[PDB]
Amino acid sequence: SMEMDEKDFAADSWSLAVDSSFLQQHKKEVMKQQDVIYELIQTELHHVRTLKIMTRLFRTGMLEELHLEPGVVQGLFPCVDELSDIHTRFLSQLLERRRQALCPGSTRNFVIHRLGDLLISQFSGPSAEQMCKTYSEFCSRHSKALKLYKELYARDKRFQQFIRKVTRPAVLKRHGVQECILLVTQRITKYPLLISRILQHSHGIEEERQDLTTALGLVKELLSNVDEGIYQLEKGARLQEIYNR
Amino acid sequence: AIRKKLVIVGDGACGKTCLLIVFSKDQFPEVYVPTVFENYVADIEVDGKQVELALWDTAGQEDYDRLRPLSYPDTDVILMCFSIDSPDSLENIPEKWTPEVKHFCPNVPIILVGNKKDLRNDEHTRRELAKMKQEPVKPEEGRDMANRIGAFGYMECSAKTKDGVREVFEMATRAALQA
Numbered sequence: 180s181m182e183m184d185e186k187d188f189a190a191d192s193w194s195l196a197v198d199s200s201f202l203q204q205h206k207k208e209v210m211k212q213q214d215v216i217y218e219l220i221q222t223e224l225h226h227v228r229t230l231k232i233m234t235r236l237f238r239t240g241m242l243e244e245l246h247l248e249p250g251v252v253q254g255l256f257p258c259v260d261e262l263s264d265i266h267t268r269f270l271s272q273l274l275e276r277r278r279q280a281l282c283p284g285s286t287r288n289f290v291i292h293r294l295g296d297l298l299i300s301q302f303s304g305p306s307a308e309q310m311c312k313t314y315s316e317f318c319s320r321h322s323k324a325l326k327l328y329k330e331l332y333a334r335d336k337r338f339q340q341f342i343r344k345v346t347r348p349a350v351l352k353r354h355g356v357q358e359c360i361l362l363v364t365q366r367i368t369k370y371p372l373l374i375s376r377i378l379q380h381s382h383g384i385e386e387e388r389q390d391l392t393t394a395l396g397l398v399k400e401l402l403s404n405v406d407e408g409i410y411q412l413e414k415g416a417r418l419q420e421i422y423n424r
Numbered sequence: 425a426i427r428k429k430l431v432i433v434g435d436g437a438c439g440k441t442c443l444l445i446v447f448s449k450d451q452f453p454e455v456y457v458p459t460v461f462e463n464y465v466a467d468i469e470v471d472g473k474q475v476e477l478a479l480w481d482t483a484g485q486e487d488y489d490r491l492r493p494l495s496y497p498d499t500d501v502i503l504m505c506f507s508i509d510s511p512d513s514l515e516n517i518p519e520k521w522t523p524e525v526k527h528f529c530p531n532v533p534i535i536l537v538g539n540k541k542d543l544r545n546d547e548h549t550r551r552e553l554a555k556m557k558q559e560p561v562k563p564e565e566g567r568d569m570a571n572r573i574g575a576f577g578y579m580e581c582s583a584k585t586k587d588g589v590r591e592v593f594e595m596a597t598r599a600a601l602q603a
């Protein structure tokens with residue numbers, strides 16, 4: 180993450196991020212809605228950061244320092260560039276909605292009233308098709324990635340030294356290779372929880388309650404399709420094992 | 425410090441998300457209770473042994489049977505949660521969550537945890553449950569379910585007041601360390 184965005188999302192809530200004199204100007208219901216939208220954006224910023232650790236720290240570090248066999252880095256980090264493209268674009272839209280809402284003279288005071296339309300756009304059309312295709316592929320390669328990592332860490336000296344070196348800093352404590360893979364797999368199932376709680380506090384404008392209701396339904400359709408398109412790939416599994424599934 | 429992995433399972437109403445948040449912060453949030461939990465690596469020292477315990481939630485995965493098992497690989501201890509204010513969450517333990525955890529995590533210790541123990545003597549809870557011919561889960565009902573499912577042990581806690589929370593995670597660490 181870049182310093183500007185980390186600082187904007189450093190507080191535990193929207194109510195602690197904005198000036199106390201700005202917070203006083205809003206009703207309780209608006210503060211509750213804004214705290215949940217802030218959590219959605221803050222966790223999206225962290226998710227994009229997880230993908231940058233996977234692409235820039237791990238993947239690129241292995242290509243530029245180690246002599247792994249061709250197709251090993253791709254097996255460890257399946258679809259990481261496609262995942263990074265989807266979520267960096269989504270994060271850009273979320274952060275631009277916050278930026279447009281800022282009060283003149285402020286870099287922290289804002290209220291986001293129209294999140295629903297952004298969520299409908301992300302979870303429909305070509306972008307939803309690409310999310311479904313990318314997560315169906317990633318989650319089906321999840322077990323194979325973990326197994327490939329375990330084998331390399333246990334048998335390759337230079338690979339083990341590389342992992343221990345880049346994961347040594349305290350800021351990488353929750354972000355080892357397998358932890359990153361599970362953080363990404365679990366991201367998609369966090370969206371309905373966040374959207375439903377934003378919806379619970381968005382009844383004040385009927386068009387906004389309707390847009391978020393449509394977005395929640397689209398997110399659930401996407402999750403059902405991804406879940407139905409998963410079959411764990413296994414290195415060395417024979418065709419007979421596959422067609423006798 | 426050896427690294428161990430903990431996963432919490434249970435129905436959406438069981439309070440698993442809140443439990444992980446309160447333990448990771450050593451505080452029940454005073455301003456905003458997060459909707460979700462990403463992950464955390466807690467530094468724990470139990471009976472003289474230092475451990476790095478990675479914590480994971482399964483919240484949001486309950487309706488997706490192919491996404492949910494992806495949280496289980498290499499788990500060292502399972503916390504199987506139910507809420508004391510919800511006898512229906514306890515009923516779903518033996519034939520829904522238990523067969524699943526034993527299949528994907530064979531020989532992994534399971535600790536059955538009764539959450540929201542502060543609501544056992546809450547008048548609103550007692551009045552509400554009485555309308556569906558029910559009452560807050562009794563400690564012996566919890567112990568009996570834990571015995572029945574072959575749990576390593578039975579414990580209770582309250583994320584709201586923190587009572588019992590330290591004890592659950594220190595016992596989970598000891599269980600994760602066993603042969």
Ligand SMILES: O=C1CC[C@@H](NC(=O)c2cscn2)CN1
Nearest residue numbers: 446447448450466467586589590
């Ligand atoms: O690194 C860490 C984070 C906080 C700590 N929490 C507690 O002991 C605790 C006792 S009751 C609620 N939390 C555990 N180890």
